[PDB]
Amino acid sequence: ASSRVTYRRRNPYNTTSNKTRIVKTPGGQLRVLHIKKRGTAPKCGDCGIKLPGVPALRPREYAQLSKPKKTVQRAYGGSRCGNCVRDRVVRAFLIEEQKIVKKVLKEQ
Amino acid sequence: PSHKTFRVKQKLAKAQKQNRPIPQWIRLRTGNTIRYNAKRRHWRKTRLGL
Amino acid sequence: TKGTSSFGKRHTKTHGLCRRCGRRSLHNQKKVCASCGYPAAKTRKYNWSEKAKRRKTTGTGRLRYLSTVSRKFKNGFQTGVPKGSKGP
Amino acid sequence: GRVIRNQRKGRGSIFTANTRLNKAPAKFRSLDYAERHGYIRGVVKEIIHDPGRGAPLARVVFNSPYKFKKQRETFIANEGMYTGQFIYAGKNAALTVGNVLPLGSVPEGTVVSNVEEKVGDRGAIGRTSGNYVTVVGHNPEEGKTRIKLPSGAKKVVSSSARGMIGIVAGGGRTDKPLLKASRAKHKFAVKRNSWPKTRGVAMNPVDHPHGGGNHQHIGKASTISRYAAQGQKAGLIAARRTGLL
RNA sequence: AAACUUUCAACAACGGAUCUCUUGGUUCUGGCAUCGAUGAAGAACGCAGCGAAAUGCGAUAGGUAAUGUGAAUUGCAGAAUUCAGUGAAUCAUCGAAUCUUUGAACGCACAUUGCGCUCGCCAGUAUUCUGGCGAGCAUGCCUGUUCGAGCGUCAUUU
RNA sequence: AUUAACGAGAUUCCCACUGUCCCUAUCUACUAUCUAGCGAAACCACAGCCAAGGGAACGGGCUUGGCAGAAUCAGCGGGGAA
RNA sequence: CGUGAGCCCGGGUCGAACGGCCUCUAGUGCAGAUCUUGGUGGUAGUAGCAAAUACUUCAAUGAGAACUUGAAGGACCGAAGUGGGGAAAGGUUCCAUGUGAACAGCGGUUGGACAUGGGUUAGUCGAUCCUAAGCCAUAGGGAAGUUCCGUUUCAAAGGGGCAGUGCCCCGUGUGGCGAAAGGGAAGCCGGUUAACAUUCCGGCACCUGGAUGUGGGUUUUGCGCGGCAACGCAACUGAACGCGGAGACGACGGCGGGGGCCCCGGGCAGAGUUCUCUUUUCUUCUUAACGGUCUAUCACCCUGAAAACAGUUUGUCUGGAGAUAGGGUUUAAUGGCCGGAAGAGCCCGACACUUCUGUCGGGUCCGGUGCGCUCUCGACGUCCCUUGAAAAUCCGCGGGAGGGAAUAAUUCUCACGCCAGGUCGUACUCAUAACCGCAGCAGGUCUCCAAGGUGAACAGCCUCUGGUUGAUAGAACAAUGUAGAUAAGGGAAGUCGGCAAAAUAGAUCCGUAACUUCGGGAAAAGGAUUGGCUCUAAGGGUUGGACAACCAACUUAGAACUGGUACGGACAGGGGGAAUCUGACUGUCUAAUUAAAACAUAGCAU
RNA sequence: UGAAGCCAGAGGAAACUCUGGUGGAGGCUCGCAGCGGUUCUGACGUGCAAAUCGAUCGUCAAAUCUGAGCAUGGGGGCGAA
RNA sequence: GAGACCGAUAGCGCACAAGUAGAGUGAUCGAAAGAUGAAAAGCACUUUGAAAAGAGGGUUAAAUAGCACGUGAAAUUGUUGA
Numbered sequence A: 001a002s003s004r005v006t007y008r009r010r011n012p013y014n015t016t017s018n019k020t021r022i023v024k025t026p027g028g029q030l031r032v033l034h035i036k037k038r039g040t041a042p043k044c045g046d047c048g049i050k051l052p053g054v055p056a057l058r059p060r061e062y063a064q065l066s067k068p069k070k071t072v073q074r075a076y077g078g079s080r081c082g083n084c085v086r087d088r089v090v091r092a093f094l095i096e097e098q099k100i101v102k103k104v105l106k107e108q
Numbered sequence B: 001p002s003h004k005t006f007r008v009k010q011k012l013a014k015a016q017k018q019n020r021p022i023p024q025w026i027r028l029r030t031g032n033t034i035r036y037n038a039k040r041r042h043w044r045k046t047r048l049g050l
Numbered sequence C: 001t002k003g004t005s006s007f008g009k010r011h012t013k014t015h016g017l018c019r020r021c022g023r024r025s026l027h028n029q030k031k032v033c034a035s036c037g038y039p040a041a042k043t044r045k046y047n048w049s050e051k052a053k054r055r056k057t058t059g060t061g062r063l064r065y066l067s068t069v070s071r072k073f074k075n076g077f078q079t080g081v082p083k084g085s086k087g088p
Numbered sequence D: 001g002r003v004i005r006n007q008r009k010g011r012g013s014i015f016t017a018n019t020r021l022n023k024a025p026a027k028f029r030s031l032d033y034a035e036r037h038g039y040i041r042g043v044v045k046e047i048i049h050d051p052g053r054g055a056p057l058a059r060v061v062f063n064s065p066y067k068f069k070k071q072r073e074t075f076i077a078n079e080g081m082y083t084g085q086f087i088y089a090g091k092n093a094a095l096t097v098g099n100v101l102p103l104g105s106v107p108e109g110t111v112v113s114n115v116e117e118k119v120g121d122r123g124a125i126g127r128t129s130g131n132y133v134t135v136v137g138h139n140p141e142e143g144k145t146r147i148k149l150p151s152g153a154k155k156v157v158s159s160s161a162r163g164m165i166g167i168v169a170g171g172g173r174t175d176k177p178l179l180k181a182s183r184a185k186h187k188f189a190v191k192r193n194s195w196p197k198t199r200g201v202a203m204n205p206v207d208h209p210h211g212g213g214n215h216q217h218i219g220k221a222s223t224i225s226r227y228a229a230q231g232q233k234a235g236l237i238a239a240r241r242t243g244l245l
Numbered sequence E: 001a002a003a004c005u006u007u008c009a010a011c012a013a014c015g016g017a018u019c020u021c022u023u024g025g026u027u028c029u030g031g032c033a034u035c036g037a038u039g040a041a042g043a044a045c046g047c048a049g050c051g052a053a054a055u056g057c058g059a060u061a062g063g064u065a066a067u068g069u070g071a072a073u074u075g076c077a078g079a080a081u082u083c084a085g086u087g088a089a090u091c092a093u094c095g096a097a098u099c100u101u102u103g104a105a106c107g108c109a110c111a112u113u114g115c116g117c118u119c120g121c122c123a124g125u126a127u128u129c130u131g132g133c134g135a136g137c138a139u140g141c142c143u144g145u146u147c148g149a150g151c152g153u154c155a156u157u158u
Numbered sequence F: 001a002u003u004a005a006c007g008a009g010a011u012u013c014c015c016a017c018u019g020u021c022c023c024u025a026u027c028u029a030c031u032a033u034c035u036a037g038c039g040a041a042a043c044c045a046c047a048g049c050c051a052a053g054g055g056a057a058c059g060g061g062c063u064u065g066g067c068a069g070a071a072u073c074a075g076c077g078g079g080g081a082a
Numbered sequence G: 001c002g003u004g005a006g007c008c009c010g011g012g013u014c015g016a017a018c019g020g021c022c023u024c025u026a027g028u029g030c031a032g033a034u035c036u037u038g039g040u041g042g043u044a045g046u047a048g049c050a051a052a053u054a055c056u057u058c059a060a061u062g063a064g065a066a067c068u069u070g071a072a073g074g075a076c077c078g079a080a081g082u083g084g085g086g087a088a089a090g091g092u093u094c095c096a097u098g099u100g101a102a103c104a105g106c107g108g109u110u111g112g113a114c115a116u117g118g119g120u121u122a123g124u125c126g127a128u129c130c131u132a133a134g135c136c137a138u139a140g141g142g143a144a145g146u147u148c149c150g151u152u153u154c155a156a157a158g159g160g161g162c163a164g165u166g167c168c169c170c171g172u173g174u175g176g177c178g179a180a181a182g183g184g185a186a187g188c189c190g191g192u193u194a195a196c197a198u199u200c201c202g203g204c205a206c207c208u209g210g211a212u213g214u215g216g217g218u219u220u221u222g223c224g225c226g227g228c229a230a231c232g233c234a235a236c237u238g239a240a241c242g243c244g245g246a247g248a249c250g251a252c253g254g255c256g257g258g259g260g261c262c263c264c265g266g267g268c269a270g271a272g273u274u275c276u277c278u279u280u281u282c283u284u285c286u287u288a289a290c291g292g293u294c295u296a297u298c299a300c301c302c303u304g305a306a307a308a309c310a311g312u313u314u315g316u317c318u319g320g321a322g323a324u325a326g327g328g329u330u331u332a333a334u335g336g337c338c339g340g341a342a343g344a345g346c347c348c349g350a351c352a353c354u355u356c357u358g359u360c361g362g363g364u365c366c367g368g369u370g371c372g373c374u375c376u377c378g379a380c381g382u383c384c385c386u387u388g389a390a391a392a393u394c395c396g397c398g399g400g401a402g403g404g405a406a407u408a409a410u411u412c413u414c415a416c417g418c419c420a421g422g423u424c425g426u427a428c429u430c431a432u433a434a435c436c437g438c439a440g441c442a443g444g445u446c447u448c449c450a451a452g453g454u455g456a457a458c459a460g461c462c463u464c465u466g467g468u469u470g471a472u473a474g475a476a477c478a479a480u481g482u483a484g485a486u487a488a489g490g491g492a493a494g495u496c497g498g499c500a501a502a503a504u505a506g507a508u509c510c511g512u513a514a515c516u517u518c519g520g521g522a523a524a525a526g527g528a529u530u531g532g533c534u535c536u537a538a539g540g541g542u543u544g545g546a547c548a549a550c551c552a553a554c555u556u557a558g559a560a561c562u563g564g565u566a567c568g569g570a571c572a573g574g575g576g577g578a579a580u581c582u583g584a585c586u587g588u589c590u591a592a593u594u595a596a597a598a599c600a601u602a603g604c605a606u
Numbered sequence H: 001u002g003a004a005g006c007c008a009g010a011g012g013a014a015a016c017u018c019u020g021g022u023g024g025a026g027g028c029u030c031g032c033a034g035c036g037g038u039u040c041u042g043a044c045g046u047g048c049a050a051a052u053c054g055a056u057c058g059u060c061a062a063a064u065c066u067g068a069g070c071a072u073g074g075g076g077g078c079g080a081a
Numbered sequence I: 001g002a003g004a005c006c007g008a009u010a011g012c013g014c015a016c017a018a019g020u021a022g023a024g025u026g027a028u029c030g031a032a033a034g035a036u037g038a039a040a041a042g043c044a045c046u047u048u049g050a051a052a053a054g055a056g057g058g059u060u061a062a063a064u065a066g067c068a069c070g071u072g073a074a075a076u077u078g079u080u081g082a
């Protein structure tokens, strides 16, 4: 027998917006379902590693999630990774302390 | 094509109503010269030029 | 292969319909009519083609308004009603 | 005849530069109060490749002294620069690689790059891969500095003209043969439409001053006067000499 | 001898010459001066009882109002109450109107019946959102109005 | 000047191979062929047998001879300076 | 009658005007001009209607049937199709009913022909929105002018708040067009028509925008808790301004996961074959969007501190900047399970029936394998003097403005509840008949899906699903043809010339020269084997402690036997060598007589 | 076919050199579709066709092929010429 | 309003549904086509045929005017006669 399928839209070309996956329907027919692109996980602003705890969706889909689902409960939330936030705390403290040490050295 | 561009679809409606034969009663009008539709168009003969 | 073979590759429709003159002469890339020259205010016509002006001149259409001007002048541009017409 | 090939290049429309992949141009930041009396500090965020150039670019981020904003700017990276480096630009900047200093505050014999002829013209001289400008000497009486250009020509510029300490990155690029018509093709495909070149002597008299004849030859001398009439300049224009050096 | 080929006549074919005509052209002469932002010329789409084109007209659509004539229109029924009619007609005249989408075309565009903004009214729990309806929003220039800018500049307070 | 590799480039030779050839023969399909239906075009002064002579010096026509019997079908490529 | 151009008369047809004479006037006399326009011949019932393998029997319809229809038989396309859809282009060719002529280069009862009617339903598909290459306004500057440049400039350019005006805040900067293949909010299944379907009907969802109630959450020192941590939970304030991410990106290679297809078993049903044989040959055994829940590479966190270095991939990378090990967190579903949902669809069997097409019963299952094919995802790797779009839009964070209850307020980023989603396209063909080529033309025209066998293989050949049987036919078998072929002996003597054809050809094993830029030449040259049948051996996985048991499908090697010594048995499938001239090589051009030594190229030089 | 890189073993006093694997580079190579157009100087040559048809052939991972949008306009364009 | 003009291959390209049908991507190019009869009185009815039509019959002054329509030349063709 034959199991070939057809596009369900008038775009006949193998473009990025014309991606399909084959399913089998309850009626016993092989059909195609047009699927959107898969989302990309948000990256860290400093190092660029995939941020844990936040889902990977298309940009418009993030408007549908609740606030806790789009971020972690740390300082820089779902924007910077934990290792980069830890470095920022140490950098801010150490450099500020060195500025004080440099200060008191200047007047004396 | 199936994508019609409404302005174009409006011209195609005009072209098929114009492609009719002449009513019989016109051929009897006491001074008539009209005998047959001399502006008949067929899709296999002449292009609409749209 | 510049003949019968090359005519098969011809499905591109350089010229489209024009809003001003209704001819299929509006260049699609230049957006300029080849007959009436319509990106512009002034209708295109030249004295080196007497036939082209003749096809486009004033007597070739309905004359929706000029046909009545001749009658208005002959009566001297009257106003009002003919001396006691019915109804105000 | 007809219009020859070098005449058609000035009109453009196929001879324009391809710049879709080229982002913001490589130049200094505008001269301001901070750099004129003092220095300002920036951070090299990342070093990038600019198509058709051959020397890497570095995007450096500064702080706006007036607006609470970060001013992005793309310099031309020097051999030694790295991401996370601190860049200091100003009259009082220290003399290290990657710092932008006025030429008047830099000792003779040094090596700088992206020198500017005029104060405010944000970078003019020494911008290709392995090229650099050498400071020959100073003259502080009127504020003028004598430099040496990559071509070997000496020149006098304002002592307030800026420059980046070091040598531009990517040196030695032209030391590797291309070996292939592809490698030349890809080299010029991102620059402009100038490859390949047909030989004028292989053309027809309608097409080029050299074309024609029953043998491929140039009828007259290839040396063309300095003031030829825009279509005669199809050879060695105003050659003081010719032949092997 | 027939057939075939060639010639002529009668009749019959093919073809549309000739003759006669003509709501057409052409040239001359006489008279007149009147397009348009109060939206022209042109274009598109529609409108008839039964119409494709031509002609006419524009959702008031082979047309309305008004005036004159005075019994039609016509290919068929449909007007016979319109017969004193206070009025037929594809009539003539024409001074009142209607005049779709466009077009110099004027909210921005238009290869889209696309996208806007202001005011008023109506409906939906609505000053903000949605729908319907109406009136609007181009550029240059002129006169005036009002609101301003400039240590250009005057005087006073200061 | 010389060059390994490469070449639907030009050239010579050798091996294999074969109908290129000695020297032709045979087979199959579709035509050509006959029939029903349908049905053009190029070309065309008039036409259409030769020999010799003369002639604008290579005639279908002229002159002198040879001759010469309806109507046709399939091939053919001498001539019609086709 | 006249020398003549012409004139006159008789006979036939015809139906409305015409003539002589004297002067005046002219667009006034045709055999030609490769004359112009129209019409008609011989040729001539002639050339021809010959590519794409192919049709036959019966019956019906009808005046008439090779090319109408039904049945039966025989065939072809053979999944890079003669199949199922579309983009451009076309415009009603779509469907039903009927039909004289014309068209379908033969016929025609048939038709993309003719005549009359009917047919295209969207918040979810696309346009519309964004920007790209680019185009056009504005400010200005040229030009006699039609207009040219200019797109952020040498411009007083704009955008919002509070109660037709008033009062405030910011401003660096201030337009539009441009993609039915780029970016992008959201719909799936079943049924239904002569012709529409992600659009109608039934069921079940989703997004955006606007309003707004209940429940729940927070708060009586005002804006949540838990975990060491990676982070989690149903919520859990957040102004200007600023920061970051997504959108957002190359080609190729092997590997791993998943969906679909293919393949192999067993079971329940049905069909085919049955001289004999085959527990046999074939077919159905299905599960959408969507709401959850449990897992799946990388990576990250905690303990701990490694040489006798260890972990580890097909591929050698990682580790005192913290590895192995142990315990966890997390991005990733086209994965399992539940709902949707068996009530659907499908397959059998039993009866109704005048039609309406009605009713009922049963079933709709369980495993395995793989360098299999296709799509997709992921981690690695290679290449670059090549590094492989932008914008609309959305989100997170920093910041802390304003506001906020102790008797009620409050987040309307939690659940449920309410309202609305405008405009245009939507039929059909997508081609050996619906597009372009004067045409129903062997030409040309972008793309998706892609079964079985043989075989390395979308090679050729045969078959299944689906689709055709359309191209003027019948009879003979002359010459000459076009296409396909075979020839004894010789083997290029033919010819300008081995032009054309033949020969070689797959796989395995052996053997391989001069020369050389050391990379090649090289498949050099040149040899041997190949079938069928019966066996044997090797190459694995899982669970229980050099073992035992239960699975698995391919590859390689060895040996007997066997045959008219045949075996890549069809298909498919290099002829080779010795040199000379020339261009280094790959690449390109004279569309429609020249593909070359010409052009180009890297390299060199000026 | 088998370049870098990687693994194992062997030889040597050393310098270092060999062998077997793995790996999968190349404007490499045979070859199907696509693209092109060498020969038959084949068919046709009032053709299917105002350039096609058949066999044979060149290339086939890239200086390969290609759609749509856009730009260049006549003494002008564009040209691996 | 006229003409010592043209008279349907003439006169304007257009005496007619003419700047129309049609061609070209486009700028543009651009035809052919008048006449039954005074009046449709445009052939009722019968018969052969599937039908188109034919034969009778009828209208008209005339069908030797049948919408292929005033007259109807020649090229070219058929029958009869010589």
Ligand SMILES: [Mg+2]
Pocket (backbone or CB within 6 Å): A017
């Ligand atoms: Mg798209």
Ligand SMILES: [Mg+2]
Pocket (backbone or CB within 6 Å): A053, A054, A055, A068, A069, A070, A071
């Ligand atoms: Mg989370």
Ligand SMILES: [Mg+2]
Pocket (backbone or CB within 6 Å): C009
């Ligand atoms: Mg094209």
Ligand SMILES: [Mg+2]
Pocket (backbone or CB within 6 Å): D202, D203, D204
């Ligand atoms: Mg040349």
Ligand SMILES: [Mg+2]
Pocket (backbone or CB within 6 Å): D001, D205, D206, D208, D209
């Ligand atoms: Mg010259």
Ligand SMILES: [Mg+2]
Pocket (backbone or CB within 6 Å): D213, D214, D215
């Ligand atoms: Mg030469």
Ligand SMILES: [Mg+2]
Pocket (backbone or CB within 6 Å): none
């Ligand atoms: Mg005689």
Ligand SMILES: [Mg+2]
Pocket (backbone or CB within 6 Å): none
């Ligand atoms: Mg003779």
Ligand SMILES: [Mg+2]
Pocket (backbone or CB within 6 Å): F060
């Ligand atoms: Mg002769």
Ligand SMILES: [Mg+2]
Pocket (backbone or CB within 6 Å): F062
């Ligand atoms: Mg004589």
Ligand SMILES: [Mg+2]
Pocket (backbone or CB within 6 Å): none
């Ligand atoms: Mg004689």
Ligand SMILES: [Mg+2]
Pocket (backbone or CB within 6 Å): F077, F079
């Ligand atoms: Mg001859």
Ligand SMILES: [Mg+2]
Pocket (backbone or CB within 6 Å): F077
């Ligand atoms: Mg012959």
Ligand SMILES: [Mg+2]
Pocket (backbone or CB within 6 Å): none
């Ligand atoms: Mg008369």
Ligand SMILES: [Mg+2]
Pocket (backbone or CB within 6 Å): G027
């Ligand atoms: Mg004359």
Ligand SMILES: [Mg+2]
Pocket (backbone or CB within 6 Å): none
């Ligand atoms: Mg004459």
